[PDB]
A paper describes a structure:
However, no structures of [name] containing AEBP2L are currently available, as all previous studies used either AEBP2S or its partial sequence, without its N-terminus. Therefore, we solved the high-resolution cryo-electron microscopy (Cryo-EM) structure of [name] in a complex with the full-length AEBP2L. We were able to solve the structure at a resolution of 3.6 Å, which to our knowledge is the highest resolution of a [name]–[name] obtained to date. These results imply that the N-terminus of AEBP2L is flexible and highly dynamic and strongly indicate that its presence does not affect the structure of the rest of [name]. This, combined with our binding assays, the Cryo-EM structure, and the histone methyltransferase assays that were carried out on nucleosomal substrates, DNA-free histones and histone tail peptides, all collectively point to the same inhibitory mechanism: the AEBP2L N-terminal region interferes with the DNA-binding activity of the [name]-[name] complex.
Polycomb repressive complex 2 ([name]) is a multiprotein chromatin repressor complex responsible for mono-, di- and tri-methylation of H3K27 (H3K27me1/2/3). [name] is an accessory subunit of [name], and its exact function remains elusive.
Author numbering:
A (entry chain E): 80 to 441
B (entry chain B): 83 to 147, 154 to 167, 182 to 217, 228 to 256, 295 to 322, 351 to 363, 423 to 545, 556 to 685
C (entry chain D): 14 to 19, 22 to 72, 80 to 123, 168 to 181, 219 to 229, 234 to 247, 259 to 305, 317 to 340, ...
D (entry chain A): 3 to 92, 112 to 412
E (entry chain C): 392 to 499
The structure:
Amino acid sequence: YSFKCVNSLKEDHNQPLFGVQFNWHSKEGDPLVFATVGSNRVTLYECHSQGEIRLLQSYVDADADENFYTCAWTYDSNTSHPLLAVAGSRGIIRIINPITMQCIKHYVGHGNAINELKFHPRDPNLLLSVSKDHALRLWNIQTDTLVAIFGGVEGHRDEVLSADYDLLGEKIMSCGMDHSLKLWRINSKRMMNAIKESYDYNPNKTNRPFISQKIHFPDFSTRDIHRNYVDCVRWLGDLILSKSCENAIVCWKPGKMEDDIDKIKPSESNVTILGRFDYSQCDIWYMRFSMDFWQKMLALGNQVGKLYVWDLEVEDPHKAKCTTLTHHKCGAAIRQTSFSRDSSILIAVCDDASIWRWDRLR
Amino acid sequence: HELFLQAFEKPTQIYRFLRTRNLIAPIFLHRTLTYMSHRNSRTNIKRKTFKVDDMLSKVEKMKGESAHLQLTFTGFFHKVTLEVLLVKVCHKKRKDVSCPIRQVPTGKKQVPLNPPSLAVSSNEFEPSNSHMVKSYSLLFRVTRFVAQMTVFDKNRRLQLLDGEYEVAMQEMQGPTLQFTLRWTGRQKLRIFYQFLYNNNTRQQTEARDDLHCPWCTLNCRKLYSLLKHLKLCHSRFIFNYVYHPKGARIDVSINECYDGSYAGNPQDIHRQPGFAFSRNGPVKRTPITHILVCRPKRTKASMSEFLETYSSGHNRLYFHSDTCLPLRPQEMEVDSEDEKDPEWLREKTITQIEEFSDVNEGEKEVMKLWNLHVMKHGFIADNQMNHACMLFVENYGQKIIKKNLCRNFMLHLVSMHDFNLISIMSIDKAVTKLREMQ
Amino acid sequence: CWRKRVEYMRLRQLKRFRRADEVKSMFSSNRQKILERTEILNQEWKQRRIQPVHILTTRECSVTSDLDFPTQVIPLKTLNAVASVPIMYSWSPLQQNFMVEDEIFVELVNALGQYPSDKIFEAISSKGTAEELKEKYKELECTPNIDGPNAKSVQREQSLHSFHTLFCRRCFKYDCFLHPFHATPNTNKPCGPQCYQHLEGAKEFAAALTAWSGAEASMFRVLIGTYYDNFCAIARLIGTKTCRQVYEFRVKESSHVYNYQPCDHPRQPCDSSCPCVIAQNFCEKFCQCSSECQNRFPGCRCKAQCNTKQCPCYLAVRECDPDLCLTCGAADHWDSKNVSCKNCSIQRGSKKHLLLAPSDVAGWGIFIKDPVQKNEFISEYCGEIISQDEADRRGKVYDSFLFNLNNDFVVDATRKGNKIRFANHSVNPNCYAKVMMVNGDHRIGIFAKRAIQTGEELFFDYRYSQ
Amino acid sequence: DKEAAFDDAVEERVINEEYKIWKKNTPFLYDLVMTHALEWPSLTAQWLPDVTRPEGKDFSIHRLVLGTHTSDEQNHLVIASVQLPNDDAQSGKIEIEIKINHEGEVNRARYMPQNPCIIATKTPSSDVLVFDYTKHPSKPDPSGECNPDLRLRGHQKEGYGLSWNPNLSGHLLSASDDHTICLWDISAVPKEGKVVDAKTIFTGHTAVVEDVSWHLLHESLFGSVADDQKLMIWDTRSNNTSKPSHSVDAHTAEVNCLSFNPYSEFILATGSADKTVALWDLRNLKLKLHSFESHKDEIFQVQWSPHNETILASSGTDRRLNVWDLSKIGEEQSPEDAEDGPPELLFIHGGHTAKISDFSWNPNEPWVICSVSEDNIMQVWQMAENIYNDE
Amino acid sequence: PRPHDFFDAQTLDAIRHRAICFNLSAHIESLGKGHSVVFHSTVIAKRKEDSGKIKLLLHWMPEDILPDVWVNESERHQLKTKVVHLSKLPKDTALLLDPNIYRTMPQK
């Protein structure tokens, strides 16, 4: 846990940024490239040696006023082009191809702002959207169709704030303002049938509009872990990591300790907690923590501009001490951090449109 | 001063290009409008005497009322080989995107350096096909300096007279080439536009001429015509008249409610980019009838701007009741995405039934099957119940035989009879049907 | 050293190390599971090739650098335009209303159990008792399926009761939703070789009574309890019995208004103290009142329609009872198509095809697809039927999709309802509301106040609607 | 490439703004505007010659013949009813009465002048179908199998030109893209039989034939226009199935439409691809009497007026329907009046945003024009009175 | 409510770019009174008739809008520049001024 900052950039509009996403879809050897969304613009950069960050691209939306919130990186199987998905307050989800330097798709089917975008780890053509409409949506980005809508009689009731796929792509966790954490399953026959039907829907084939899937009942819901806002959850193997306004990250698992995750009955009413990670100065919400692709370390932003880095090695809830890498320039706040495909560099975003970088030394 | 230019940045650029397009490619003739008729001067006093045969008469009377030319060069005063070609252009056909070109050569001799070479052209060009060719031209190409010279005019009348001429040359004080060619055979008003922004005035101007539309430079005559033109043809603005006694004053404000919506197919708006606005192809449309003008009244001729639609059918894009996705016109058919039995209700019924602990599955299964049946058909009147029962043994009986749950089914029938809803005969017949089917 | 010891430390450390080992093992295993899936994902990644990103070939954006790097300038490609839709919180489809309504001390006492006797009971008390934990030291079914393998003979009460206690007569469903819960259990030729009579003496003994088996006998019991000495029926219904066997077995064993409640008087007239008569509530068909309850309601005898002010079931706000109004036809067409009656529209339910679209005033709007007349029927305002206090609390937290059913309930369409829920507010409306008593429960009918053509909008007035 | 797409996007936004500007200024240029969106676009339109007058009311009734052009659907020949307010106008309703089934798009519809119950249509195939809306149900049978009373066999490819013969009976001419003109005597052998044979075939043209029209006074005179840039005048009695009687190089490009003058026997007009509307006279077809040049693109339909004699209207793919005036040729103009346009241009109608497939005059209500476009927009409109009228 | 206006900032930006370029070249609203274009004359050829006289040619500087004309020697002056109203330009050639002056949208 030893990084040496080598660069620090500042934008021009000085409006806060929210998203950083390394492109993990680059062949080994291709240059490291990442994206960053802000007030109403996006930015595309490449990382170079000696702490050099070279500007590559930037777009802007002038037709209205909106706040972009997140971003997502995938690829197109047909022609091998990179694809970037962005989402903002207007509820529109925009899919853009950097190769053609043009927006290629837009999806508008929500009722409020979008908060998180994630894709299926195996399927590159399933897009998951989390919104302020209390419901989660899942689209097929190829056939221009929806697949399933999560939410309803027994679902979230207030402001779903985040969701996360498991390491394999058949279980999803969701968390919102109503202090509730809910589990959705994708391995059911229902979901694969809907997916397989979604991969074949020609509008010029039948007079019937496509039939979506409504899921009104989660696999397991609870409000006992925290007692306040929960804004970020993460799959760590078969364990769950989550955060609240209680300045402490918690790792736990559903059911009892001996219980498995593929035998949990839907009417479960007991949760086994495992451990806690301590830090300070997280009194406001909307800060996300990130983990490396190899699942070997953890990074988390801070309001006073500091950092907190742990390791997912043999050591775990014991302590792992608390590595803090800080600099004297920006102490505004930090929204999201990101690692490259390997552990080379770590990027963080400060609240005043200032981007940072920390290279990995020994 | 930066603020108001930012404000009027959006309409002004559109209106400039619209000015140009309207002047070159008009929408409507401005002399045909009612409030600008003074622009036109002639009167319809000849649609009573005009006889179409007299057109032939007069036109015929008025309109009723080869050579192998040689050219000799004198030398090219440059500071080198040259040839002369006849280059002509053919009329555009529907097949041919643009006007095609054809060049025919002559192959003359070269010329001395800064001081023989001559040509004798002929009737190779055909004036008969005036329906094919547009115009011809003589060319002086090749470097080591190019020039061109048209020969015939619009109505194929050659203008190149007989004589000796000196023409220049250009690549791809200058090179020159002389030759010779011979055929061988009331007071001004003070209207002050006053632009407004941020609820306070920020600029004024002055058009001392009687008036011109500052965006399009159309010259109408009177003040009422000016207000009429400004208010309608520039709807993106909000003009406003007050009566400044010496002259006239006009104000400006950006319209917060301007119908800038798309006014075409209400399906093209939500189409993935690239597939939006295809144009080429037939598309189903939702019937819509309008009446914009039915019978107007030519009320007075002035004293209105300063002194002081019908509908039908469908004119909107409809949406699915559950996904907030657009609804196709084809899908706008008898399908109504609504029925008596939602799936979440059925699943919740099953889950709530299973929630009980002091009940046996031999009862829970019967309860679930009957509940699903009743929810599926929705019986209301008591007299329906008996028919319900037989329908039930007609419908779910197979499944019950798969479970052999008939004994509890008889018990449920007896309990139903306890509520005065079934008779002995109905119970007996249902039991017979179940036995026979089993 | 009794209170000082309260033993605590030993089991505290025991639980400590046990929990530590359990979490260590679980976490190490979880890491092991992470490894294989991550390896599979990496091997998946190793078979892909993706093009790189290239710098572009009119406002320009700039980015500087605090740590000694020159300012960089790149142009700014403007993005395309996308339409938008009005805000919409989630909802669910509904067609009919949906009613809605120390540990260380335990470780220590267990340890004491593991380990005159009062000396080990008053020590932990100073736990908290020398008797409660003394009691701790001392300390340290349903009727099955008749179809099932295990069962037993039992009286009529058991299974008939299990059925009786979960069947809403008003509803025709088991444990259904919109009806409140209460417990009110309501009460020749010969056969062949082994006919029931089979002799004069057996018939005489049967008349006197009128004055080998297993669990099925209980069923037999209940059957007899409602069949009253059948000749063929009992042996017939039961699997493989014979009438003589049934006879012998019998001989051997014998050796505005509040919601309409039913006027179920045990022994009293429908008139005087009736709970549904102190509030004018007409005693509908579900009363246990006398069959000649004068507080009951007759039916219309009209033939063509009940729409006019002639129908008795139309003046007193009511929808034609499908068991009493036989001439209008509310009972005809059991669940079939169009009925001549016009005051029988809500019961079956005949919604006119509605379409959703962005409104012309605020938010969303609902538009009727086909023309209607001045007093036709369109839809019902469904949702959640809640109590008045909950209505107040929900109104407080929301601050309003609320409506007033009666003086005892409130209809909310905030989370459940149908398409008619939007009906943007106005002062000049196109529709209107009329609360109707259908069958036994209150309902809401949204009629048209005027003529509506193909493609208008409905503006039901909320002002006088609470 | 991308340049073309950007040009199209800019052009579409500009056209939308222009259509809004036109919408604002409707009540200063017309006295009646009626816009309707058909379910499918129509490639034909012709006012039927019968009009009903509902007494004690404020709306007459007229009938129109339309068609459908759709992909992956059924096809119909549509007989529609329209309401127009009377002299003391206010009052609007357009409906589809008869919807018989077709096979392929309706490229042309032309009723028989003698009996308003015969509608011959030209199929995207080679055959010429002849229906009769009376002897058919009021709705298409769900089978979708046509049953045209007759079916006239002929050329080997589709066409766009169909024309009956007034002052006679049963003589229908057709033009196809196989450089031939076909004649049929439907009057003879009048029955429900399915095959009739072409009486004669004319092969004068050497290019795709685009239109053919009989004479309105002379019985045996008809003119043909094709992609050959010529106008070709025939006469049936003379045995000249190949050679014409008058060949005229009309235009420098393709010609698509001819139209004889109802009130004369010498005047005829042409509308060509060279963006000009020429004039001709049968007495000497070598002096182009006049050219009308305002259109920005191809010219497809040129039709005279049923009531007035000097009013000619021509349309094309420039989304305009310029209405001309013969009596105004050569008049002296004021400066600004000259800046606007030539004196002949009396009106320009910019209500359509797509190529105008067809338009037609009303014969029982003067100065009423019905025009359809490829954007499914059909407009029935009448220009303002003060334009053609006077003090 | 506010309809999403059809003129997105993209097409307006393109119009602004083409407008600044065209007005940088064609000089309207600055050297012309908003309703005109100005052309400058260039002498390309000199011609001598057999009888005593000289007729020059003038190739207008912007060119591809106007055709060439034989002009007398004296009349070179007063014809150095020519200002033409927009409505009087040759219609067949006027479409070269801008791509979106006229366009046949239903292409193919």
